[PDB]
Amino acid sequence: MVTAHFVLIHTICHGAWIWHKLKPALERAGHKVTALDMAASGIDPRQIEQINSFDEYSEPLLTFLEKLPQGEKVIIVGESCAGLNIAIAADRYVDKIAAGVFHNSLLPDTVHSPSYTVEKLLESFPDARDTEYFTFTNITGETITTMKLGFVLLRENLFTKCTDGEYELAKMVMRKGSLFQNVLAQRPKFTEKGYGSIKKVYIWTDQDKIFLPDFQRWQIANYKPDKVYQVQGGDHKLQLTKTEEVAHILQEVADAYA
């Protein structure tokens, strides 16, 4: 129906590998799909300790968008923390973006600080259970906290309904990550002209065991998307547990925003 170019953006600690089932699904319907590793994620060669902000973390997306041929538009699909990558990119390249799709994701706004929905998530889900934390100082002196996600947290909260083959893959390639929360606290808010203006579709499930229903419904209330699609069942990783559902919603988004 409309075929589109989708750019898929994994969350912190993960990599382009999280989209290994969704990328062929979309390509079966004629779409062009780009799945990117953000800095220090997946097989990106940088280590997290050399990344100094969330905007530097987003560099693979911003370079890609910088090079997109004149006149092409993409649909950026972001899971979990990647809603901050969509907002950073949309402020810089608003006219290359047909729409932002948030998949059980942070939905930033223009009214509060960039770290605001991170504050809210951590308030809703304050214990990362067996996750380990570490810190380093970034090049301007700020202390950055990194984490290594715990495998119990991975099995029960993130990959709740995923097959054993998928959970095992997650453990074999997961890397350290950081919210850069304090640097986000200090960041200028997202602009109305860029991020504020793009089309926004929010996909979620009430069976998510880490972005809990109440936080997700709060986000929607706080900055109402153009469209909200609720998938029944699945878990936090709907691109693994409800792959054909997400491919179908994404076809609707290509039909609507081309």
Tell me which residues are annotated as active site: 80, 236
Among 16, 77, 210, 253, binds ligand HBA (CB under 6 A): 210
Strand extents, DSSP E, 122-163: 132-137, 143-148
Among 6, 7, 8, 11, binds ligand HBA (CB under 6 A): 11
Determine whether 112 is exposed, middle or buried from the number of CB atoms within 10 Å of its CB (0-12, 13-18, 19+). middle
13 carries a ligand binding annotation: no
Quote the CA–CA distance of 162 and 143 in Å, as a whole number.
35
Distances in Å between the alpha carbon of 125 and those of 103, 157, 243? 18, 11, 25
Among ligand HBA, its own copies, none, what does residue 247 contact (CB within 5–8 Å per kind)? none
* Interior angle at CA 94, CA 85 and CA 63, nearest 5: 55
122 belongs to the binding site for ligand HBA (CB under 6 A)? yes
Quote the CA–CA distance of 44 and 6 in Å, as a whole number.
20
Quote the least distance from Cβ 128 to its own copies, whole Å.
Answer: 20
Quote the least distance from Cβ 79 to ligand HBA, whole Å.
Answer: 7
Quote the least distance from Cβ 255 to ligand HBA, whole Å.
Answer: 28
One-letter amino acid of 234: G
140 belongs to the binding site for its own copies (CB under 8 A)? yes
CB atoms within 10 A of CB 9: 33
- CB of 15 or CB of 83, closer to its own copies: 15
Among its own copies, ligand HBA, none, what does residue 11 contact (CB within 5–8 Å per kind)? ligand HBA
Give the range of 6-14, 27-35, 47-55, 61-69 binding ligand HBA by CB under 6 A.
Answer: 6-14
Please choose, from the candidates 68, 84, 86, 70, the residue with its C-alpha nearest in 3D space to the C-alpha of residue 8.
86
113 carries a ligand binding annotation: no
Strand extents, DSSP E, the chain: 5-9, 32-36, 74-79, 97-103, 132-137, 143-148, 200-204, 227-230
66-85 burial string, b = 16+ CB within 10 Å, else e? eebeeeeebbbbbbbbbbbb
Instruction: Return the residues of window 42-61 that contact its own copies according to CB under 8 A.
Output: 42-43, 45-47, 49-50, 52-53, 55-56
Residues of this chain that interact with its own copies (CB under 8 A) are 15-17, 19-21, 23-24, 35, 37, 42-43, 45-47, 49-50, 52-53, 55-56, 62, 66, 91-94, 136-141, 164-166, 168-169, 172-175, 188, 191, 193-194
As annotated, the binding site for acetone includes 11, 80-81
The annotated binding site for 2-hydroxy-2-methylpropanenitrile is made up of 11, 80
